[PDB]
Design a protein around this ligand. Structure first.
Ligand SMILES: Nc1ncnc2c1ncn2[C@@H]1O[C@H](COP(=O)(O)OP(=O)(O)O)[C@@H](O)[C@H]1O
Ligand SMILES: [Mg+2]
Ligand code: NA
Length: 222
């Protein structure tokens, strides 16, 4: 029932987010290629495994990869530099590669089996990443009539994701690349000096400024 919050690594981003990404919610990060969507996903997959006084939820991670951008050595790096054992961190991340959008849909069903298994253990799943939420959908549904059909399949997939978030008290974190019904939309862009800037889109309950952070050996951080 009460909502959990997963620190991103960046104090600035966390404040913008109201303390971190929420369980019982789908948080969508969207932005151009190279903006940092996948790096934020990597960092979150580590942060969630921290205890709560360090901004985590003692959680396991399920990661649905659609573009083969998951890097286990990046996870090990981030974990090591934040004082976690990198091999242990990796063992609590369950990555599956989605071959196409239908298999991506099926993987969400399978995620429920893994979630149920871990639920009342000491490392329940607390984060479900889809990176990228839309890349297969953009690629497969194209041409006259595909707008309605793509949106319908995507809405179904997002409904499935929202049910897991709410039913199991999990944060869902999804990426979308920009040249549907997410709970919170975060616009990410690359700024001057290598900085990254985040802004919330249509989110009255949180701050209306922008967060600024860097991508480092610790993942993201101010
Ligand atoms: N270890 C690192 N330290 C600093 N910047 C990094 C590191 N690793 C990757 N990056 C930067 O992250 C950016 C890519 O982020 P990425 O999450 O893949 O973008 P997206 O998923 O939004 O296309 C690149 O600019 C790259 O230089
Ligand atoms: Mg990416
Ligand atoms: Na919490």
């Amino acid at each position: 029932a009460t909502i959990g919050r997963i620190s991103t690594g960046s104090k600035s981003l966390d404040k913008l987010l109201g303390g971190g990404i929420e369980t019982q919610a789908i948080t969508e990060v969207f932005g151009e290629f190279g903006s940092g969507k996948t790096q934020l996903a990597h960092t979150l997959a580590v942060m969630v495994q921290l205890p709560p006084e360090e901004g985590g939820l003692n959680g396991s991670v399920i990661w649905i990869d659609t573009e083969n951008t998951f890097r286990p050595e990046r996870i090990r790096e981030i974990a090591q530099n934040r004082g976690l054992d990198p091999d242990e961190v990796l063992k609590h991340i369950y990555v599956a590669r989605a071959f196409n959008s239908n298999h991506q849909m099926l993987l969400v069903q399978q995620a429920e089996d893994k979630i149920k298994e871990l639920l009342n253990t000491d490392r329940p799943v607390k984060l479900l990443i889809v990176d990228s939420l839309t890349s297969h959908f953009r690629s497969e549904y194209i041409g006259r009539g595909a707008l309605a059909e793509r949106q319908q399949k995507l809405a179904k997939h997002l409904a499935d994701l929202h049910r897991l978030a709410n039913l199991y008290d999990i944060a869902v974190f999804v990426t979308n690349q920009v040249q549907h019904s997410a709970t919170l939309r975060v616009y990410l862009r690359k700024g001057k000096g290598g900085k990254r800037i985040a802004r919330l889109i249509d989110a009255p309950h949180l701050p209306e400024g922008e967060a600024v952070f860097s991508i480092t050996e610790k993942g993201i951080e101010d």
